Amino acid sequence: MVRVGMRAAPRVSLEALKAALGGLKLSEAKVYLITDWQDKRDQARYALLLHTGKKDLLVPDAFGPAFPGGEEALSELVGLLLAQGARRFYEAVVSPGEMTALLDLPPEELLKRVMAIANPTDPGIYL
């Protein structure tokens, strides 16, 4: 599993993911948006885990309106996922204290946890 970007750097994370994704087809990939506080999205932060099935890609909690330009970064990100043909979007709810260590767990544990906790979501709520 790869980890790109850095926390609280929305545009750096967005550009790093733009470069790293390339021409990868996301028709069978699963996009996990990791966040806290289900209800309040105005101050929410977001991390991303991209489970392609053959390899996974991690981006730390650097998206969302919680950071300057992070809202537009999340919108562009989800828009690009949809453009690349991603259909399966999920929203994972972790505790604020978890969110940091969860990206420091080993890949298999982190991915099993995310797949267990993820909720099917309308990507439109991030557009």
């Binding site: 289900q38 267990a116 909720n119 979501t121 309308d122 439109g124 709520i125």
Partner: protein, 166 residues
Amino acid sequence: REGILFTTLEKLVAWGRSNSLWPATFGLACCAIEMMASTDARNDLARFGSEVFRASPRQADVMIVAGRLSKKMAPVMRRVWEQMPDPKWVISMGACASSGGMFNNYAIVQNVDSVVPVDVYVPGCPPRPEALIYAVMQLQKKVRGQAYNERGERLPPVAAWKRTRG
């Protein structure tokens, strides 16, 4: 044209829609049976305008998600909602629908607002049929523009009017 752009016409059409609210039940669990009780001959949601009940989704404005929404049912309910006419509203009935409820696990969606734009929430396990009527009057006066939250804000008539569907 969405019921807008004239002071009298929009209030009139909102009146019309509010009283003509057409429920389409999406029964999942025991919340669905407690909603079936909201139609019997003790307390009927058959007076305000909800007498008729068209199983088709092309024919109703109100989508009432009644029960626990399993993650395997989420895309089905998603597409049933997308396959509705556009002036449409969403009620989330019961704890399992509103939040994860007492079933906090891999199987159940922890907020139906994740998949569908929810208009009204109604707690309870099950929520009483009269609480559901309170919710539909709540939605009624919401589409009348008579609804406010605890913060003082007026609420838009139609949620799912604010989302980039795709």
